[PDB]
Protein: UDP-N-acetylmuramate--L-alanine ligase
Amino acid sequence: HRRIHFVGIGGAGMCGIAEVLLNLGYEVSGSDLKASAVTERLEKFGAQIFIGHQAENADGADVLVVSSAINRANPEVASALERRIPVVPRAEMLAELMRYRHGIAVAGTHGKTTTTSLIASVFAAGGLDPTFVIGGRLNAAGTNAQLGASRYLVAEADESDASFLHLQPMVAVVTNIDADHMATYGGDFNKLKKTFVEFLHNLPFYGLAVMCVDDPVVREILPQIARPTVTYGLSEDADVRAINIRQEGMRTWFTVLRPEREPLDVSVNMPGLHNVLNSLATIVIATDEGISDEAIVQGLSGFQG
Amino acid sequence: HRRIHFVGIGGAGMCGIAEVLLNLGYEVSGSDLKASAVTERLEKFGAQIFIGHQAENADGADVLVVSSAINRANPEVASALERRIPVVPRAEMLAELMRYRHGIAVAGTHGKTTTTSLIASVFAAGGLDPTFVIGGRLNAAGTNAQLGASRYLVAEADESDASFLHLQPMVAVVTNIDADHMATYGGDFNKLKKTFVEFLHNLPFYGLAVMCVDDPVVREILPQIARPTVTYGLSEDADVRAINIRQEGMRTWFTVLRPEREPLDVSVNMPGLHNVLNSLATIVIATDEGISDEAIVQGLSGFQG
Amino acid sequence: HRRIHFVGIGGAGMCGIAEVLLNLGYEVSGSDLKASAVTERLEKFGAQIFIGHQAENADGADVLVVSSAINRANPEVASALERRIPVVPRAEMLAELMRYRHGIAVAGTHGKTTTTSLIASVFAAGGLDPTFVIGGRLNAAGTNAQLGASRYLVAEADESDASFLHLQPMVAVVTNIDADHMATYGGDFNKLKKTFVEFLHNLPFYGLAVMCVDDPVVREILPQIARPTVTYGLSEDADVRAINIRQEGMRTWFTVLRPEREPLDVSVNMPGLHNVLNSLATIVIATDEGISDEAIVQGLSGFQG
Amino acid sequence: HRRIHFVGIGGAGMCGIAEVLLNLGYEVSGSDLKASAVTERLEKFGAQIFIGHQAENADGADVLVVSSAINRANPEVASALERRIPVVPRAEMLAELMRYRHGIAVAGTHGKTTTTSLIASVFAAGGLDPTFVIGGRLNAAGTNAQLGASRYLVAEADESDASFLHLQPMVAVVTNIDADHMATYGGDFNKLKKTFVEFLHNLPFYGLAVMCVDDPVVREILPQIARPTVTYGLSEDADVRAINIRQEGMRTWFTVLRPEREPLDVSVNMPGLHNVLNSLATIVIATDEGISDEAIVQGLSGFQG
Structure:
């Protein structure tokens, strides 16, 4: 399959996915009601754009991507269904892109967004220009380059999304495990917990699970994770720890302890222990990746918030 | 992570996996009670072999693979558990090999074995010398070359195996969906059915699902497969069908119909409609792959049984 | 080989090469008399910096890189020769970077520099953020990202350079063949011609040769190029031509004709037929690579000089 | 460019090149006067075969490959020349195959053939089933598998061949440098010598040169080789040496000394010091590639002659 066709390609969650697919070398077409700078950018990069939803727009596509739900009223969708051309939802296509890159999946019911941003800021500090996903939208610091150009794709993994268990990361973070989204799992928190174990098991045997042992549910499932693991937190027995947490004005300073390294002092612009933990997750990922102390410090301290 | 240690590396389903990991460039070590020609061949290909079990044999391992359960009486396994070295069961490591190759997963409650063998036979006749997994044992035809050398890895996928949902194939077959293994899904055939759907959704959007629509359960779940699909069977509405089934001795002849090709006359050396169907499934994969008609005929005809 | 040691890593032509090698995943170290922002950037990206020259700085290195400004008395190079560690000049290391990337070699005695710049500008318009080499110095637009990140390396190819015939490009341009550098080839123009033929034969059989047939010597060697070729110029028999050249201020307008395409009005911010020709070479490369007409029009016109 | 057409595809040096290109994923067509089992095998592997020569046979080809000189009279060759479609000689396409594989180029005026066979034998014993090239004909041990399937391509490199300096190997061997082919270089041994330096300089900085220092001309040019180099010979200063040479029947025994290894006893089934040296060269390559002593001992011992 080589031509992907987006119904509503100008839609916020959609344009960024089409751009990555263009970066990977696929043929991309798309349809939208209105033309905008977002459609002209995609066009400049090689997408075929159609204005209006006529059934013929889907002609030649090997797969369709739709924004919300499968709408057989849309003649583009209906025509593909009538010819058994697969129609995948936006969220699954988003998840697939990680199969083409060194994917860092940031799970956890709270702390996903800030941790993704801190990772991205630190990797950018190291010159790696990562593409990252927050709230379903793809981004990168560099604005003229195409999304997906980096070797790295950093994304939050929502355990209430139907593609959670289809992520294929190289590294996976679990900041915490909360019962917010029990309803996705038959309102049973034990099923939700088992899903996190399954998620962590989609890592390869050479992957890396990065786990907040300060969360007692994370600490409970740790022995079940048959993958390389690095723990972090304030806990005395965590692999990577923060001590001497202090404040200078509106900024938080602390010392990070890591295996086989000297203690490293660090600061971040945001308050609260949770942002200290989000920095530790970030420091774990960057350390394992080979990023320098200078880039870690620079990325953590420059993140606005 | 780059050195894998096998507890019982000489075992029947272990040595093949060690050999493929050697072929992929990893460092492989293992232990066994008895020195063997199996362990000698592994040593010739670069594995480090220890005779007898001693906790030091696991030193420097990034991961251990064990033959079944975690017999934590074994010193190596216990030394790994203490040092937080993941201990991965045999079948998980076997399933993960497909991420390194063009994987073909042969699923279906019955027909898995013959279909996998037929596929290997046709690809072999096409010069592709695939590695294939039957009954948990890795094989190939040319026997001096390491397992894994082929671009292709053809494996049976058992839905009662805990690794079923962790296979990452490029092409998936479903020969039939029977209720033999309802116990694995809490004695619920509907749970079983949904797992075959989840299985097929591990295909990427450019993968291929090959479905026997002669099976009514496979026909029921077909509309939920949001992946490229080719159907086969004797049903008049199948994409790839067999017609004019005849016999001459212990060999079955029939004509295969394919979209956009001329009718092809084929024989196979095995009786019954089910082997006609396993041949249809093979003809589908081979055709998608680009293998010549000549290799298809020779692959199917020369297979003994 | 995995550790490259630059003697004078902060020098003007050395720092870019080291940064690319870092982007390729090599271990990079380097010495210099003075720490600078250049040495800080490389350090932040993972290079080990030594200040001051001393024999042990080269310890562990698999290869040394030296520029013209390095004496044989330099202790680091002296120690390397004593241990049979290879010492390669900066220009050769520079020419071998194309082996990792899709290399576009911009050759031809006059116009190398503008044509390289035009290619980079057009490719950037399509969001490809290429790294490019002008006067031996590596650059890219995205300032925070590491040199070498793009799939594309566009480089001046200089026939007076000893490494001319070790370039391994995927596409090669010859703007013109002049006698300026006869002295590199025994002071014999015909040997210089033969050198250009051998240069183009470094292309793979699937590569592209882009030849200005307005140059009589380029036209003369054309039947010796056993590679795929697209010709450009004002000559009516060129594959890609400019017609209806006109002016509107400091801007030059013309129509470009391409096989199997509609005519495209184009404008560049530089005078003279030579800059029309440099634009045709750019358009040929861009068209072949798949870049949109909009990116071609925008890259060409937005270039200053 | 994606379709290669072979004029005289059944020929002795042509069919193997076509087969490797098939294994590389290219479209291959070919013409011949008589159908053969050779053309049938290639047809089974994907090649379109044409019996008899006709100008249409070259329709759609991006490059042609010819058996000797550019026949001009041949209708397919003439058709291609009229469309400016490149026509490469057999030897040039054969040398291009190395850019796709881990290429080991065995050069030297004498000993090329035995040394290539010894390398193939050792690699095969290590389970790597190399494709190797002797007398312009490609071969491999396993016979149903397509040529080119191995990661390794081992080829003799002849300095009287027009493509000698177009090889792109990973490892280069120089067994010795004689004046046999002075005529190729204007009857001047000093130019011939310089060609061997330039040949070795087509290695990347991560390549490896393997040099017999028992040859005084090899020893003379050694300091000019700015690539990683391992020396071998009987000379007391060679990096890898043979000592304790003795006989036991038609079998030569000797001990091999290697940097940072224990001495290894080996035997070969051929007489003479020159086959001790060709064995030494084979041992350098195998050692650097990581092949075990068992495979070295077995490959060398089991080679007939």
Q: What stands out?
A: DSSP finds nine helices and 15 strands in chain A.
